[PDB]
Enzyme design. Structure first.
Site, PDB file in Angstrom:
ATOM      1  N   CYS A  54       0.614  -1.281   0.103  1.00 28.14           N
ATOM      2  CA  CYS A  54       0.035   0.129  -0.094  1.00 28.14           C
ATOM      3  C   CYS A  54       0.852   1.344   0.085  1.00 28.14           C
ATOM      4  O   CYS A  54       0.156   2.575  -0.087  1.00 28.14           O
ATOM      5  CB  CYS A  54      -0.850   0.071   1.181  1.00 28.14           C
ATOM      6  N   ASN A  56       3.286   2.447  -2.115  1.00 28.24           N
ATOM      7  CA  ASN A  56       4.067   3.243  -3.296  1.00 28.24           C
ATOM      8  C   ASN A  56       3.165   2.539  -4.572  1.00 28.24           C
ATOM      9  O   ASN A  56       2.546   1.548  -4.405  1.00 28.24           O
ATOM     10  CB  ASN A  56       5.197   2.850  -3.289  1.00 28.24           C
ATOM     11  N   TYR A  58       1.135   1.763  -7.763  1.00 25.34           N
ATOM     12  CA  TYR A  58       0.016   1.190  -7.837  1.00 25.34           C
ATOM     13  C   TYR A  58      -0.759   0.835  -6.766  1.00 25.34           C
ATOM     14  O   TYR A  58      -1.946   1.199  -6.531  1.00 25.34           O
ATOM     15  CB  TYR A  58      -0.145   0.102  -8.933  1.00 25.34           C
ATOM     16  N   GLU A  80       8.136  -1.808   5.665  1.00 24.36           N
ATOM     17  CA  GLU A  80       8.837  -0.604   5.530  1.00 24.36           C
ATOM     18  C   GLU A  80       9.998  -0.609   6.439  1.00 24.36           C
ATOM     19  O   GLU A  80      10.117  -1.406   7.529  1.00 24.36           O
ATOM     20  CB  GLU A  80       8.171   0.682   5.880  1.00 24.36           C
ATOM     21  N   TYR A 230       2.039  -6.865 -15.892  1.00 27.07           N
ATOM     22  CA  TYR A 230       2.344  -6.116 -17.158  1.00 27.07           C
ATOM     23  C   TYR A 230       2.606  -6.857 -18.304  1.00 27.07           C
ATOM     24  O   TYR A 230       3.188  -8.191 -18.111  1.00 27.07           O
ATOM     25  CB  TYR A 230       3.636  -5.135 -16.781  1.00 27.07           C
ATOM     26  N   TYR A 240       8.837 -10.376 -20.477  1.00 24.44           N
ATOM     27  CA  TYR A 240       7.820 -10.368 -20.009  1.00 24.44           C
ATOM     28  C   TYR A 240       6.436 -11.201 -20.772  1.00 24.44           C
ATOM     29  O   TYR A 240       5.800 -11.851 -20.002  1.00 24.44           O
ATOM     30  CB  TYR A 240       7.041  -8.663 -20.369  1.00 24.44           C
TER      31      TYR A 240
END
EC number: 1.3.1.44
Length: 397
Positions: A54, A56, A58, A80, A230, A240
């Protein structure tokens, strides 16, 4: 002391406390203007939201959109390092402080759980808090971004890699701060790196989060859960699509699929988002040059988006629409990279990448925009901040 950016090995080591705060506030201000009463009119809305990762990108935008756009109660989870009086905290720490402070001012319920979201302990703290306040989640955003994961059942730590299979992937790249075009490569990965990458970037923890919450009866009927991913342009398919990242995404997709099968009362999706500057972008071949070119093209066309633009559009135009549908591609994936992968965009980007040289890079591409996004993630280069003013301490604001 006066806090300036300190970048070593393509990573910004420190963070600006006030800059991070301003960054959160700017996203809140946009959200209030983007998610209006008219946009929300005639559509459903989130009520109780869990956001995993939560602090950073998106994830942060997802919590902000839910809270300050829809008025939802949010529980956020991130890992963090706390600030302390003299040393730096991670930018996500300051972001969480800014969010909770803003949420409290608005009169919104907001609880942040700091710790390893891959751990059963952190899951237990979530369940406990949810049980305490009589919360059943109706939206669960899975946006965890970590290079490492400790298996909760074995204790073994796994490390992800960003590499192709079979042959070495080689392409151009650009240093947005020096303007230098380079040629870098990613060597092909082995079976261990491949398995480890899936272990870290696949959908195992996501499914574990859901199954535990479901067992405790903490899921509202028809609960939406999303995992961000992505797909990218043709130029980076070696990673990817068919690379270690590609296998992890495949696992993510099969997971969202299995989730829907075993929980008929749930709505699970992989949400494919647009490309953006991340911590790992610098070491990936092609990506920095592509993004710089993409930013240039999309800003000229008028369809450029950052995190908060992306996610507000996600909520308003996918999750909570007036027609009550959730648009997906032929593989049941939510696509908000649809503007990025437009033919007119991709052809313009491809033509642009071929013309880039050392002399024209700053002019031909949005290296300026790239530098800003890279710096703003840590609270640097954000508008309205002195920066020549020194920071008194690092455990606040």
């Amino acid at each position: 002391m006066i806090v300036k950016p300190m970048v070593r090995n393509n990573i910004c080591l420190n963070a600006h406390p006030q800059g991070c705060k301003k960054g959160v506030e700017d996203q809140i201000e946009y959200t209030k203007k983007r998610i209006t009463a008219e946009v929300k009119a005639g559509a459903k809305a989130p009520k109780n939201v869990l956001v995993l990762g939560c602090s950073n990108g998106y994830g942060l935008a997802s919590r902000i959109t839910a809270a300050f756009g829809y008025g939802a109660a949010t529980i956020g989870v991130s890992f963090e390092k706390a600030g302390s009086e003299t040393k730096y905290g991670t930018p996500g720490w300051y972001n969480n402080l800014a969010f909770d402070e803003a949420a409290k001012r608005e009169g919104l319920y907001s609880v942040t759980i700091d710790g390893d979201a891959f751990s059963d302990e952190i899951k237990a703290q979530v369940i406990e808090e949810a049980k305490k306040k009589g919360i059943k989640f109706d939206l669960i955003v899975y946006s965890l971004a970590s290079p490492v994961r400790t298996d909760p059942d074995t204790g073994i730590m796994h490390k992800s890699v960003l590499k192709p299979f079979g042959k070495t992937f080689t392409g151009k790249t650009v240093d947005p701060f020096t303007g230098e075009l380079k040629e870098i490569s990613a060597e092909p990965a082995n079976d261990e790196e491949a398995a480890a990458t899936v272990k870290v970037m696949g959908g195992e923890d996501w499914e574990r989060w859901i199954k535990q919450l479901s067992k405790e009866g903490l899921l509202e009927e028809g609960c939406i859960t999303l995992a961000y991913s992505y797909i990218g342009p043709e130029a980076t398919q070696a990673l990817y699509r068919k690379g270690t990242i590609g296998k992890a995404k495949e696992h993510l997709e099969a997971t969202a699929h299995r989730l829907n099968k075993e929980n008929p009362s749930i709505r699970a999706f992989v949400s494919v988002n647009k490309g953006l500057v991340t911590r790992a972008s610098a070491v990936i071949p092609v990506i920095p040059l592509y993004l710089a070119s993409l930013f240039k093209v999309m800003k000229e066309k008028g369809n450029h988006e950052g995190c908060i633009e992306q996610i507000t559009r996600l909520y308003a135009e996918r999750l909570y629409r007036k027609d009550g549908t959730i648009p997906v591609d032929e593989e049941n994936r939510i696509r908000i990279d649809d503007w990025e992968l437009e033919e007119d965009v991709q052809k313009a980007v491809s033509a642009l990448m071929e013309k880039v040289t050392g002399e024209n890079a700053e002019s031909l591409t949005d290296l300026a925009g790239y530098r800003h996004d890279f710096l703003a993630s840590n609270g640097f280069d954000v508008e309205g901040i002195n920066y020549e003013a020194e920071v008194e301490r690092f455990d606040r604001i």
